[PDB]
Amino acid sequence: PVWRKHYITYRINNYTPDMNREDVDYAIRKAFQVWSNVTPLKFSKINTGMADILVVFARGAHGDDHAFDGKGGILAHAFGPGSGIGGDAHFDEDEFWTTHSGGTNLFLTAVHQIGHSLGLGHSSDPKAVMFPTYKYVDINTFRLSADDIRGIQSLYG
Numbered sequence: 001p002v003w004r005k006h007y008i009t010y011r012i013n014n015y016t017p018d019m020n021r022e023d024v025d026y027a028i029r030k031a032f033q034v035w036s037n038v039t040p041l042k043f044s045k046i047n048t049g050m051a052d053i054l055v056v057f058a059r060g061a062h063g064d065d066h067a068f069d070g071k072g073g074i075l076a077h078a079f080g081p082g083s084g085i086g087g088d089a090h091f092d093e094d095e096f097w098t099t100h101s102g103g104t105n106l107f108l109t110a111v112h113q114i115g116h117s118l119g120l121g122h123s124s125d126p127k128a129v130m131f132p133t134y135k136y137v138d139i140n141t142f143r144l145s146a147d148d149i150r151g152i153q154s155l156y157g
């Protein structure tokens with residue numbers, strides 16, 4: 001249930017019009033960084049070819065048999081480690097993605113979904129990033145909880 005290599009590629013398949021491109025790239029890259037800070041994994045954005053983790057913005061039905069649901073409800077989903085669609089993280093474009101507190105924060109959502117792309121389940125600690133409910137936390141004080149660190153290190157340490 002894990003990536004069996006420690007150099008992992010991602011590609012941004014497409015950009016949400018909600019946010020400037022620069023802010024999308026920065027959110028995503030920072031989100032990956034959160035995990036590469038507590039494991040030996042290295043993440044590399046690529047701009048051509050097939051990436052391990054593909055990052056997709058889409059609405060409703062988008063060709064994976066798990067349609068999204070409009071504004072609210074499900075925000076995003078992600079497939080666990082594997083080939084093809086494995087690892088891929090999809091973000092519901094009917095949300096309003098933002099760099100701060102308005103709408104839904106892309107960074108925080110990405111940290112969570114990349115958790116799942118890496119093989120994590122959910123946490124019972126409301127402080128954890130892998131807690132199952134979205135809430136805006138102070139990104140200046142953001143930090144992985146002990147539960148996240150133990151989970152991720154059990155897979156990749």
Ligand SMILES: CC(=O)N[C@H]1[C@H](OCCCn2cc(CN([C@@H](C(=O)O)C(C)C)S(=O)(=O)c3ccc(-c4ccccc4)cc3)nn2)O[C@H](COC(C)=O)[C@@H](OC(C)=O)[C@@H]1OC(C)=O
Pocket residue numbers: 071072073074075076077078108109112113116128129130131132133134135
């Ligand atoms: C679990 C849940 O909250 N479901 C909500 C319900 O969701 C239906 C789908 C059930 N569900 C939710 C999830 C968790 N999500 C994904 C996940 O775990 O990644 C999976 C689909 C892959 S998620 O989209 O909801 C999700 C994504 C990111 C995060 C996250 C982001 C940042 C930090 C931490 C967590 C949390 C949840 N799994 N199944 O929608 C309803 C309507 O939504 C509106 C208008 O906001 C919710 O009603 C509200 C807000 O009161 C409803 O709340 C209830 C009763 O469960």
Ligand SMILES: [Ca+2]
Pocket residue numbers: 068069070071072073074075092094095
């Ligand atoms: Ca939705």
Ligand SMILES: [Ca+2]
Pocket residue numbers: 051052053054082083084085086087088
């Ligand atoms: Ca993949």
Ligand SMILES: [Ca+2]
Pocket residue numbers: 016017018092093094095096097
């Ligand atoms: Ca949107």
Ligand SMILES: [Zn+2]
Pocket residue numbers: 062064066077090
């Ligand atoms: Zn999908």
Ligand SMILES: [Zn+2]
Pocket residue numbers: 112116122130131132
């Ligand atoms: Zn989740």
